[PDB]
PDB file of C-alpha atoms (C1' of nucleotides) in Angstrom:
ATOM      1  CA  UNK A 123      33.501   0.055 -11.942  1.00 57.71           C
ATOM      2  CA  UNK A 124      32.656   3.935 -12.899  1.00 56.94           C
ATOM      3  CA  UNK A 125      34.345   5.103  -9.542  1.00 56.15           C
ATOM      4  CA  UNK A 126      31.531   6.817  -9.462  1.00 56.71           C
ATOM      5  CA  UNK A 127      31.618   8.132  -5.600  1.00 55.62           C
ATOM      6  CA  UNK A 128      28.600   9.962  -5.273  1.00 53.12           C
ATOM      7  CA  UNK A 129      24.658   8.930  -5.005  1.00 55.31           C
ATOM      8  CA  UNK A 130      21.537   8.657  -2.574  1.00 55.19           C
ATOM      9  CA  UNK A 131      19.964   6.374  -0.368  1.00 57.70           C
ATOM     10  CA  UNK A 132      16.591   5.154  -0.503  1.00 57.27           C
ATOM     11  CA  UNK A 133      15.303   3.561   2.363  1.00 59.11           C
ATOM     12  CA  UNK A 134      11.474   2.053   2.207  1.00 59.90           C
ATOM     13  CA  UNK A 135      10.254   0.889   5.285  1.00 61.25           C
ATOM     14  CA  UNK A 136       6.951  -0.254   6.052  1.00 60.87           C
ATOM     15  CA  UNK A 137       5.329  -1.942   9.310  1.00 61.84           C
ATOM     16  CA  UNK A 138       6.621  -5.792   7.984  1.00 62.96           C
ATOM     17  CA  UNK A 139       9.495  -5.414   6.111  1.00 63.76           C
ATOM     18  CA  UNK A 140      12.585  -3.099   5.301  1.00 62.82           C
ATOM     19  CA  UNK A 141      14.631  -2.303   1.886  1.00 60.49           C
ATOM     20  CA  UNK A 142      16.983   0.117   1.564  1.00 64.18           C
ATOM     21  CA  UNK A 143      18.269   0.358  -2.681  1.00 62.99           C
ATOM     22  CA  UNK A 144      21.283   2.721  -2.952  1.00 65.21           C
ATOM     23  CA  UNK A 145      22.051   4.358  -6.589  1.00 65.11           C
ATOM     24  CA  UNK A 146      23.558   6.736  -8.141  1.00 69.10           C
ATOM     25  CA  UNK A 147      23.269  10.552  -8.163  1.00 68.38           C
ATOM     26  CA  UNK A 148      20.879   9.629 -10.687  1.00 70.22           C
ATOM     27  CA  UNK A 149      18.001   6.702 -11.604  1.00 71.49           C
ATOM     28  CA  UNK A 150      20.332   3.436 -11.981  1.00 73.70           C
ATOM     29  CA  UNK A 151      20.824   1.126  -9.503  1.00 72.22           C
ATOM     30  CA  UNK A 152      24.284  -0.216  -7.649  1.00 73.42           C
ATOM     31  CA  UNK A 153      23.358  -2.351  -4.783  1.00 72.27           C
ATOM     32  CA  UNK A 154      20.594  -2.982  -2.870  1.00 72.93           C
ATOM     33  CA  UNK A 155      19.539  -4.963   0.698  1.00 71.76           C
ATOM     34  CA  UNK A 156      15.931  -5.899   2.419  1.00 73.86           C
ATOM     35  CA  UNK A 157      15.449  -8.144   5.635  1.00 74.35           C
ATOM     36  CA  UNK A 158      14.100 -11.547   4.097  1.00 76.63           C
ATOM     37  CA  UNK A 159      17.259 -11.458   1.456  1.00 75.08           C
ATOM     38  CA  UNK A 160      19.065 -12.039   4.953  1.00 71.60           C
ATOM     39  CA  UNK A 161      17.478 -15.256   5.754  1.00 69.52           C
ATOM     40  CA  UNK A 162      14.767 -13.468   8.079  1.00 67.85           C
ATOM     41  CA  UNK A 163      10.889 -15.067   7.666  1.00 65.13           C
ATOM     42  CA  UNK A 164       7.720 -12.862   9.425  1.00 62.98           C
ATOM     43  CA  UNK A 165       7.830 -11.270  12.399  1.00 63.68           C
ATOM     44  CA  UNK A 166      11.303 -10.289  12.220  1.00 66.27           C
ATOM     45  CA  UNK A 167      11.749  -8.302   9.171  1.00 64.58           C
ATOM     46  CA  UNK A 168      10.730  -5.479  11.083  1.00 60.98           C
ATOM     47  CA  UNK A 169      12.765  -4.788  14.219  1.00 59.36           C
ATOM     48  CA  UNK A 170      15.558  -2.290  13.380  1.00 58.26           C
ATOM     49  CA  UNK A 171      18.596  -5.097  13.341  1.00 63.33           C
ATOM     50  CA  UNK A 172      17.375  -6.449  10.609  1.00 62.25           C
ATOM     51  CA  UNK A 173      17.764  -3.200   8.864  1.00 62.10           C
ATOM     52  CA  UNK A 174      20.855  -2.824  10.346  1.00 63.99           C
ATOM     53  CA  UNK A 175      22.247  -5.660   8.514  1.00 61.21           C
ATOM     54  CA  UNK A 176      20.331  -4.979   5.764  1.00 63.56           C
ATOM     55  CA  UNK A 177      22.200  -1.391   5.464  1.00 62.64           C
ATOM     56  CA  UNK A 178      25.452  -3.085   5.828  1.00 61.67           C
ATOM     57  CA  UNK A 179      24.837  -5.446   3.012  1.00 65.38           C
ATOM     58  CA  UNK A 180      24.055  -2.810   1.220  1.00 59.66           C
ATOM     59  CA  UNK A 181      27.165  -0.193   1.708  1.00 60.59           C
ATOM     60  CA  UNK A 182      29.751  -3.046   1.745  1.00 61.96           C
ATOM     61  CA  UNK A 183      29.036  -3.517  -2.350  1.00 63.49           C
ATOM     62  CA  UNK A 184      28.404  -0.102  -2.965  1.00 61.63           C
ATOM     63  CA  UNK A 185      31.704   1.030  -1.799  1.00 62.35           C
ATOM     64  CA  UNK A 186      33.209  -1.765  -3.593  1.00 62.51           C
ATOM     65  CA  UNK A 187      32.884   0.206  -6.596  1.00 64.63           C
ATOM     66  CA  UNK A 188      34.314   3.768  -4.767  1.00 66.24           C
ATOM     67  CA  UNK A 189      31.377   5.801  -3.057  1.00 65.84           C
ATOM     68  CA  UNK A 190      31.602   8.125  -0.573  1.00 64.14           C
ATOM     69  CA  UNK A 191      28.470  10.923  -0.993  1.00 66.67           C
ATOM     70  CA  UNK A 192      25.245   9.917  -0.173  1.00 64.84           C
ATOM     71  CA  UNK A 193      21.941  11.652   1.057  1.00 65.96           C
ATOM     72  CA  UNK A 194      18.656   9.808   2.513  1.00 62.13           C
ATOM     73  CA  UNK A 195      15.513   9.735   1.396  1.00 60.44           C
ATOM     74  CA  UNK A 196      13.177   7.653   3.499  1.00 59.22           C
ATOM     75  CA  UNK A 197       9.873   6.800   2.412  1.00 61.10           C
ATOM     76  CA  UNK A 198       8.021   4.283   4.318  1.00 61.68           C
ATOM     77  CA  UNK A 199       6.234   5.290   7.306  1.00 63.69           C
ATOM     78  CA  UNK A 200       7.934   2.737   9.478  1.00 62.20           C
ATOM     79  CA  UNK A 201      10.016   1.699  12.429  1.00 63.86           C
ATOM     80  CA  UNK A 202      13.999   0.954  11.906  1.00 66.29           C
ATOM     81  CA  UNK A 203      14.036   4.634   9.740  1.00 67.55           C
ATOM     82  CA  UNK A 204      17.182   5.534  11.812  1.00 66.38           C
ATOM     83  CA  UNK A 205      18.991   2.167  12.663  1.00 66.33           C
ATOM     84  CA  UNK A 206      19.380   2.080   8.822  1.00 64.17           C
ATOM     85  CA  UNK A 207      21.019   5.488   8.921  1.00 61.27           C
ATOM     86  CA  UNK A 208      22.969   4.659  11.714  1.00 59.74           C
ATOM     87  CA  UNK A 209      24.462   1.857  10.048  1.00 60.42           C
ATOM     88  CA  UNK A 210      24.988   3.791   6.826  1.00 62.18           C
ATOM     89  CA  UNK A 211      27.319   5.943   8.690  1.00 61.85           C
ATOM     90  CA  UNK A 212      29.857   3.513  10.835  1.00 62.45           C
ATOM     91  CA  UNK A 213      30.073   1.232   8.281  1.00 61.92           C
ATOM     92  CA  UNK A 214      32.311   3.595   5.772  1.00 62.45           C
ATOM     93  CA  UNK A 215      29.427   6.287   3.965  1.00 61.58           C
ATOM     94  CA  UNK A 216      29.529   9.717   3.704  1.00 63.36           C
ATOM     95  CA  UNK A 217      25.943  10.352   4.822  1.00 60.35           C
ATOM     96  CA  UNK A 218      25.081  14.718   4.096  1.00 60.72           C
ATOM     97  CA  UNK A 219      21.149  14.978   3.644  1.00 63.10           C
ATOM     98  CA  UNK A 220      18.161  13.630   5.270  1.00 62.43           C
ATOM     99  CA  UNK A 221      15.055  14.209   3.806  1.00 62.50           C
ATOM    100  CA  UNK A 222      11.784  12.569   4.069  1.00 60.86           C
ATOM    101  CA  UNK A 223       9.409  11.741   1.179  1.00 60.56           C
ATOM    102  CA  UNK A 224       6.266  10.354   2.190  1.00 60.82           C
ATOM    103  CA  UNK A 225       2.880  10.277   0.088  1.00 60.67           C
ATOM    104  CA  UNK A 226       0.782  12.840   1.093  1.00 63.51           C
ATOM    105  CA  UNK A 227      -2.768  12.715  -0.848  1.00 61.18           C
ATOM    106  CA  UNK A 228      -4.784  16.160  -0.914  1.00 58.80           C
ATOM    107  CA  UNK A 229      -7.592  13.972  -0.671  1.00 61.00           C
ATOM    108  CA  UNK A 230      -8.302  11.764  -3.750  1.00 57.83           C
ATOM    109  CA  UNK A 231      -8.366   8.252  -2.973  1.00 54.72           C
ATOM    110  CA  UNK A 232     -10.715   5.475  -1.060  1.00 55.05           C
ATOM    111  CA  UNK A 233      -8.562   3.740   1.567  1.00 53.35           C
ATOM    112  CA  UNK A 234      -9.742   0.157   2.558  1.00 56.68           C
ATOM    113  CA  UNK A 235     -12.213  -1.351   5.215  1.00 59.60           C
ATOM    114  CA  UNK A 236     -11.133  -0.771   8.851  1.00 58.21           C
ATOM    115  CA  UNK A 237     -10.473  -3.997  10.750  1.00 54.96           C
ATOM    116  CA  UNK A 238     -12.371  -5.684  12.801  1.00 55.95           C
ATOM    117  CA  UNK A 239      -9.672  -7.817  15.182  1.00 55.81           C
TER     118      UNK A 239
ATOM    119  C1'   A B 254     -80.215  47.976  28.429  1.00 58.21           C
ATOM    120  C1'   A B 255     -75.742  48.949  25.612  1.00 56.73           C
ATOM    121  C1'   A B 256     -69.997  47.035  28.621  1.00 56.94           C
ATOM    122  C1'   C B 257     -68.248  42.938  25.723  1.00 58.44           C
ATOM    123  C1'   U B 258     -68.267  39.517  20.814  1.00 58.23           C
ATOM    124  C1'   G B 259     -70.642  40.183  15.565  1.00 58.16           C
ATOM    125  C1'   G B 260     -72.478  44.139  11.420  1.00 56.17           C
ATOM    126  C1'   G B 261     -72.150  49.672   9.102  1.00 58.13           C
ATOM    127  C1'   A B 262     -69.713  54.692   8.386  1.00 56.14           C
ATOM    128  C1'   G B 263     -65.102  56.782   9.676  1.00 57.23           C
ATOM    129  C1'   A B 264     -60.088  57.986  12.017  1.00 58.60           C
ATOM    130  C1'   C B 265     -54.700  56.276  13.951  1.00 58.70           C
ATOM    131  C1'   U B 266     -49.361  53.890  13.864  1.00 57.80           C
ATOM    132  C1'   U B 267     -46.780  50.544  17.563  1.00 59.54           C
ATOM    133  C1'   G B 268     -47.996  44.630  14.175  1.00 58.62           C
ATOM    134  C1'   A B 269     -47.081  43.576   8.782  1.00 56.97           C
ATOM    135  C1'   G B 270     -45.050  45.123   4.263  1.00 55.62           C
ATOM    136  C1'   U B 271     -42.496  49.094   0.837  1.00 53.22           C
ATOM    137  C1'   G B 272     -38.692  52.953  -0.269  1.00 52.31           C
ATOM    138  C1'   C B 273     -33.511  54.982   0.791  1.00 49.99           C
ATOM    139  C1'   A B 274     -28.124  53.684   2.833  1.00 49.53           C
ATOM    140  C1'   G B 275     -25.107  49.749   4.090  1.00 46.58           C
ATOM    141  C1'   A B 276     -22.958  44.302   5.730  1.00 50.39           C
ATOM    142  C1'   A B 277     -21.637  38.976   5.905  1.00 49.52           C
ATOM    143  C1'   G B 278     -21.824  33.988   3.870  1.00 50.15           C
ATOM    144  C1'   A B 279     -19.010  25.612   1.958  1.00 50.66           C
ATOM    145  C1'   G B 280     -27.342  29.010  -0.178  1.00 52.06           C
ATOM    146  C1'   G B 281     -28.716  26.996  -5.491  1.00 54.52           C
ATOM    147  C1'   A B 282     -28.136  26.140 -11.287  1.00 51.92           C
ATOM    148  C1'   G B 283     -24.635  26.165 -15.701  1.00 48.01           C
ATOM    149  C1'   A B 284     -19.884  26.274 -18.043  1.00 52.43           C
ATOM    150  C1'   G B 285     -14.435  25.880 -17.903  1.00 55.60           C
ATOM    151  C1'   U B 286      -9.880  25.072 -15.161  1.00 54.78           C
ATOM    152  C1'   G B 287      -5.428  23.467 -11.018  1.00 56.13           C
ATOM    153  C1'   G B 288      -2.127  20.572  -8.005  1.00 58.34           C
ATOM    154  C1'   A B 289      -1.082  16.015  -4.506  1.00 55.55           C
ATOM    155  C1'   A B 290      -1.749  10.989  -4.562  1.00 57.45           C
ATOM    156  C1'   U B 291      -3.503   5.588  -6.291  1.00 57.12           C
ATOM    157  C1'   U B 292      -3.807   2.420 -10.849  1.00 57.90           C
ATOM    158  C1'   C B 293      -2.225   0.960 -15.751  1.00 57.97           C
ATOM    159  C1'   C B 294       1.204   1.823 -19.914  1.00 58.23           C
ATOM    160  C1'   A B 295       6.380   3.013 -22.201  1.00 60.09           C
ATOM    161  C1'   U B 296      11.583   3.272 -21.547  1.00 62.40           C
ATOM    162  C1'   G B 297      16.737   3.033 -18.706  1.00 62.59           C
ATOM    163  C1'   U B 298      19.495   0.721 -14.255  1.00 62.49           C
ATOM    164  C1'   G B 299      18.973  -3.393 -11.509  1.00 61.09           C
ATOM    165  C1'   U B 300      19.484  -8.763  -8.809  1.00 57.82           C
ATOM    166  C1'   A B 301      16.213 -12.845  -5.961  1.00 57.71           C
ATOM    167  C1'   G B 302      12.602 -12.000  -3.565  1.00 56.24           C
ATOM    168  C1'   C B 303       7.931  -9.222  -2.709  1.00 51.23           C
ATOM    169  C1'   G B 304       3.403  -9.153  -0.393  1.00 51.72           C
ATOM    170  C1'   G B 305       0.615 -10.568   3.956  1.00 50.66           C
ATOM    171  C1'   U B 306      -0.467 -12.325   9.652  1.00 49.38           C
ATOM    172  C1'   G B 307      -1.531 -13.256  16.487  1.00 47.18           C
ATOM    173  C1'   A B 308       1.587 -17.494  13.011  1.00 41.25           C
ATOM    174  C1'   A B 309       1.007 -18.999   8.320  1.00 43.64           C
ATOM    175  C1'   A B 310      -0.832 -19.856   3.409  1.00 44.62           C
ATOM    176  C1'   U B 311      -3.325 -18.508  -1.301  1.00 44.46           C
ATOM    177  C1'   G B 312      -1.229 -14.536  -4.785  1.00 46.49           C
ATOM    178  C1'   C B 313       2.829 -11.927  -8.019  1.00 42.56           C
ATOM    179  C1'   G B 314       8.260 -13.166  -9.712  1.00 43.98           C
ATOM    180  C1'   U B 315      14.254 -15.184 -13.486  1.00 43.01           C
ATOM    181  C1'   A B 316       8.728 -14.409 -20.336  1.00 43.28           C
ATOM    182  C1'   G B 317      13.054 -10.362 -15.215  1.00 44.59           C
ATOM    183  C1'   A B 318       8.881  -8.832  -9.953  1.00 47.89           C
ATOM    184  C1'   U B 319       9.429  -5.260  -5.827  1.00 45.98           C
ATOM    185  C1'   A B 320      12.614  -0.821  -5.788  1.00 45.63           C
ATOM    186  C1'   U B 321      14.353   3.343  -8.647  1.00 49.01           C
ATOM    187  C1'   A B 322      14.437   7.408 -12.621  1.00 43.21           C
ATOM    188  C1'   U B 323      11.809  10.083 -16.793  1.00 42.07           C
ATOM    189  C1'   G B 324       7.192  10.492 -19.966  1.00 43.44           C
ATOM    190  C1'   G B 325       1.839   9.440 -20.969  1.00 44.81           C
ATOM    191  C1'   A B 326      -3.708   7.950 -19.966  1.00 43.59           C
ATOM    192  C1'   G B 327      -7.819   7.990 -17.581  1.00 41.39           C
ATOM    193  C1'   G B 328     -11.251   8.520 -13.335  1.00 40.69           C
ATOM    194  C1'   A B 329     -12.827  10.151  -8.590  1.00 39.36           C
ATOM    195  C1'   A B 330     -12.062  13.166  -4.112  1.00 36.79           C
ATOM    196  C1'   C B 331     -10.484  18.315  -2.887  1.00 36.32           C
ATOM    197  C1'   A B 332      -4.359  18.266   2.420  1.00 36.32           C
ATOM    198  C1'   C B 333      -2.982  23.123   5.228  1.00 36.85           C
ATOM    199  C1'   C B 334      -6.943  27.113   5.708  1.00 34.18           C
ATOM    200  C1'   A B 335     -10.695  24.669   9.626  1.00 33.21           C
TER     201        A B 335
END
RNA sequence: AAACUGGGAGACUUGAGUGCAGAAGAGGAGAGUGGAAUUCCAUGUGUAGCGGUGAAAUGCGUAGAUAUAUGGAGGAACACCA
């Protein structure tokens, strides 16, 4: 539905999970993935295969509506970054940009308490 | 008695200040202003999780969360320079 066959993939990755939403060349969403919608609980939902799968899940809908352009922008200062490219690729997408896009304050906020483990 | 310390009348320019000619600086007080990010709000797309740990649970979520796109509101601190 509206063959649209071009968009962007945003990949959010943090230290204890993984999503990666892919939409349009603009705003709406198509399909999206993360590791616990795959039946992973903990520990797991941040070694790269989960994010491998999780990519998968992802492309195999959104090019069952026609979509080959794509760029990458990863936010998420994280781990699997590139296994979820990887997969993006050799499973059927049309990867062109990579570009990161990571929250950089100029100094403005008050982070928390350091840990004491 | 008259070297030294004290007192009295003077004299001097090296200490101390003043004039003239220049230099650097997150020194202080007042008044405006900028961009990056966090939170909340509004609207579109959007399906079942998100978040968190050494592992879990409490918490938020099908009164449509998280994500994602555009617009507003307020406060505090000023990345690189260093």
């Amino acid at each position: 539905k509206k063959n649209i066959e071009s968009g962007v993939a945003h990949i959010h990755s943090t230290f204890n999970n993984t999503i990666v939403m892919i939409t349009d060349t603009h705003g709406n969403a198509l399909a999206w993935s993360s590791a616990g919608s795959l039946g992973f609980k903990g520990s797991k939902k941040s070694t790269p295969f989960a994010a491998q799968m999780a990519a998968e899940a992802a492309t195999k809908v959104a090019m069952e509506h026609g979509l080959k352009t794509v760029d990458v922008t990863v936010k998420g200062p994280g781990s699997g970054r590139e296994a979820a490219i990887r997969s993006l690729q050799a499973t059927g997408l049309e990867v062109t940009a990579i570009r990161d896009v990571t929250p950089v304050p100029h100094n403005g906020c008050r982070p928390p308490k350091r840990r004491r483990v």
